[PDB]
Amino acid sequence: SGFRKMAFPSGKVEGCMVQVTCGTTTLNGLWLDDVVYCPRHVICTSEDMLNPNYEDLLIRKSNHNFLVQAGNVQLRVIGHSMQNCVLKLKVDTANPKTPKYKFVRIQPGQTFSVLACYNGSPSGVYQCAMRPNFTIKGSFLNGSCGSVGFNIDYDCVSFCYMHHMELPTGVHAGTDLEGNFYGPFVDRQTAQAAGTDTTITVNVLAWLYAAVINGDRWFLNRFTTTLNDFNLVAMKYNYEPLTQDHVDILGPLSAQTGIAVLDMCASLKELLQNGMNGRTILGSALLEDEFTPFDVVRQCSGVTFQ
Amino acid sequence: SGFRKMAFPSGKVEGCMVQVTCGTTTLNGLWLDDVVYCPRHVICTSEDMLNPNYEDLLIRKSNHNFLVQAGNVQLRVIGHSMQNCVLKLKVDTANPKTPKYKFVRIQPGQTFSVLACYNGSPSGVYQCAMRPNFTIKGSFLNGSCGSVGFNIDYDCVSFCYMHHMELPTGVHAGTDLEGNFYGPFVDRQTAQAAGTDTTITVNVLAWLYAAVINGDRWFLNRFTTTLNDFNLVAMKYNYEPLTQDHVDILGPLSAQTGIAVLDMCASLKELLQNGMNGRTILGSALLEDEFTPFDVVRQCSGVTFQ
Ligand code: NA
């Protein structure tokens, strides 16, 4: 037993990380088959970043202006193209370590692992959630751009995130692997409003199920509620509305614990209205929302990869 | 910017994980060169765990009683030997993915990453601390036994932990890679008391420095303390005594932030006495003690591995 924030094993992603240099800018690229994927702002200086015309900046670059290094192997660039906010650098060599993969665009509230990288080399792996406002609360320094987020299902790597920027607020924004930003963000060093963020209600509930399974039960109460009643409370506390689809997703955890979702909603409601009275749940003095129902089932059943 | 509980990239360790089955018992092993290392209780049934004579039990076992799977391939056991609480299974094939490695015995309060595994298959990676009482608060399901803990220094994997036991109280006990238990624990399914745990003071200070570097400064004050007077208060809240060795270890973080160690101790003193009063530090409602000073420096300056 025990319950931890767990990242996917990073080995299949480590084998794909490369360094991309264009003029004086170096960041990270992802090498799958004979294509290297990286943030288009590799072609920008910090001056260009205030108001970049990517089309005109890219027209100045040839294949040989892109230095791509995989460990010590120099790759040769034989094509370049811009797709939305990503550059695709065609190289003359297939990555022999290419895992089975998919490109996926994740929904807000979904979790993924980030392999944080500098100069094409891995520094660390951590789990996070795509906030309802399509930001992530990461650990990204100067040079981390091109670091990717992913899920692993047995042998298949689903790439869902590439890192592009830090907002002035110190939260993180980036794209899917087709180069489309999550949220309204743009690859320009400018003031950018993220949404009002909200708590991922179905994730908090999943983690209350996790707590019961590990023997934390103090917050279980003799109340029930309705969806519409619970949702009036969720709106007051800036929690995402709960839908029947969310109830259906929680059903296996309901079945295990013998606690009907609406009874667990009545418990969450009392926690929102009364606070936690300085008590903890799974070693947290806050309600955690960065575990999906699928993450709680995975960690509580013992699913594996390779 | 941003600060996350970051694990080491796990690729080097993934290539070393195998499955070891002896009769009804399956757990994880570590394949380095032509040796597979695993918990010696792989030779025990649940029935045997009550009072095993390992010497006698190991005598009844033949090489071919040890089923070793490295993915789709079965390794041939040609040797079995006991070192303290680890079995070394000699195999006919050296691991071609053997990284540069050391075995190291770590100190209470030091941190490491765990590659959690089931039936030889890596399932996830997390960073934890060796508690002052030599337990780890992990996430370990039936058969996660044999999962290892490690650090990386440049190119060399330093293995420091193998998981052996889930204590009845729900924390975890295990050995160095020479099979010596951390703390007073034994590989017997028995009631075992863990010592009184304490909070890792030098780690909480390191994490307060990480907070300031990331723009969380509300807990700073213009109060002073001697090491001796801080320790009188730490003693009251079950915090480890802070030594000069500890103050010296925090010096680089003092130097970067311009906040004297004893000034940060004056801050922590205030935090223990008045609590956090509804406020958070780096997103946490509690004081975090699973970051070392070294962990904060390498996260905050973007150290990488190859
Ligand atoms: Na721990």
Angstrom distances, CA of residue A94 to CA of A33, A34, A98, B44, B265: 4, 4, 8, 47, 54
Q: In this structure, which long-range contacts are made by residues B149-154, counting pairs with CB atoms below 8 Å and at least 24 apart in sequence?
A: B149/B112, B149/B113, B149/B114, B149/B174, B150/B8, B150/B13, B150/B112, B150/B113, B150/B115, B151/B8, B151/B104, B151/B111, B151/B112, B151/B113, B152/B8, B152/B9, B152/B12, B152/B305, B154/B305, B154/B306
Looking up tokens 């070393």, which residue turns up?
B16
A41 classed as catalytic: yes
Report B:195-214 residues touching A (Cβ under 8 A): 214
Question: What CATH number is attached to the domain comprising A252?
Answer: 1.10.1840.10
Helix (H), strand (E), coil (C) string for B242-262: CCHHHHHHCHHHHHHHCCCHH
From the list A118, A170, A302, the residue facing B118 with the nearest CB is A302
Phi, psi dihedral angles at A238 (to 5 degrees): 55, 50
Q: How many angstroms is it from B29 CA to the middle of ligand 1?
A: 22
Phi, psi dihedral angles at A292 (to 5 degrees): -75, 160
From the list B124, B144, B214, the residue facing A7 with the nearest CB is B124
Contacts of A1 in chain B (CB under 8 A): 139-141, 166, 170
Q: Which residues of B are catalytic?
A: 41, 145
Query: In a 3-state reduction of DSSP, which class is residue B28?
Result: strand
Contacts of B119 in chain A (CB under 8 A): 304
Q: Are B121 and B147 in contact (CB under 8 A)?
A: no
The residue type at A188: R
Q: Are B90 and B74 in contact (CB under 8 A)?
A: no
> 3-state SS of chain B: helix, strand, coil percent to 5?
25, 30, 45
Nearest to A128 by CA among A269, A18, A267, A288: A288
From the list A122, A137, A303, the residue facing B304 with the nearest CB is A122
Give the method used.
Answer: X-ray
DSSP B190: S
User: At a CB cut-off of 8 Å and minimum separation 6, what does A188 contact?
Assistant: A49, A50, A51, A52
Q: Tell me how long chain A is.
A: 306
Are B124 and A8 inside 8 Å of each other by CB? yes
| Angstrom resolution of this structure | 1.7
Are B128 and A4 inside 8 Å of each other by CB? yes
Q: Are A180 and A85 in contact (CB under 8 A)?
A: yes
Q: Are B203 and B211 in contact (CB under 8 A)?
A: no
From the list A9, A15, A138, the residue facing B10 with the nearest CB is A9
Contacts of B299 in chain A (CB under 8 A): 123-124, 139
Which residues have CB less than 5 Å away from ligand 1 (the ion)?
A: B 128-129, 136-137
**Structure token digits, residue A140:** 């990204």
Determine how many CB atoms are found less than 10 A away from the CB of residue A47. Answer: 9
Nearest to A149 by CA among A28, A248, A306, A247: A28
Gap between the Cα atoms of B190 and B166, Å rounded: 10
Residues linked to residue A181 through DSSP beta bridges, in sequence order: A175
Show the DSSP H helices in chain A as ranges: 11-14, 54-59, 201-213, 227-236, 244-249, 251-257, 261-274, 293-301
Angstrom distances, CA of residue A26 to CA of A144, B108, B282: 10, 39, 29
Gap between the Cα atoms of B160 and B180, Å rounded: 11
Chain A: give the shortest CA distance to residue B153, in Å: 11
Kindly provide the b/e burial profile for residues A202-236, where b requires at least 16 CB atoms within 10 angstroms of the residue's own CB: bbbbbbbbbbbbbebeebbeeeebebeebbebbee
Question: What CATH number is attached to the domain comprising B41?
Answer: 2.40.10.10
Q: Are B86 and B180 in contact (CB under 8 A)?
A: no
Gap between the Cα atoms of A305 and A153, Å rounded: 7
Looking up tokens 């650990």, which residue turns up?
A139
Tell me the angle at which helices B227-236 and B261-274 cross, rounded to the nearest 10 degrees.
30
Residues linked to residue B25 through DSSP beta bridges, in sequence order: B22
Element (H, E) at B114: strand B111-118
- Rg over CA atoms, chain A: 22
β-strands A35-39, B73-75 pairing: unpaired
User: At a CB cut-off of 8 Å and minimum separation 6, what does B2 contact?
Assistant: A137, A138, A139, A140, A170, A171, A172, B214
Residues linked to residue A21 through DSSP beta bridges, in sequence order: A26, A67
A294 has a chain B CB within 8 A of its CB: no
**Structure token digits, residue B261:** 């160690």
Chain B: give the shortest CA distance to residue A56, in Å: 31
β-strands A25-32, B101-103 pairing: unpaired
Q: Are A6 and B124 in contact (CB under 8 A)?
A: yes
- The whole domain housing A243 covers 201-301
Q: How many angstroms is it from B182 CA to the middle of ligand 1?
A: 13
For every residue of B52-75, DSSP letters joined together read --HHHHHHT--GGGEEEEETTEEE
Contacts of A121 in chain B (CB under 8 A): 304-306
Determine how many CB atoms are found less than 10 A away from the CB of residue B179. Answer: 20
Report A:44-83 residues touching B (Cβ under 8 A): 71
Q: What is the dihedral of CA A10, A14, A16, A21, to 10 degrees?
A: 130
Exposed/middle/buried for residue A33 (C-beta within 10 Å: 0-12, 13-18, 19+) = exposed
The residue type at B149: G
**Structure token digits, residue B121:** 């298959």
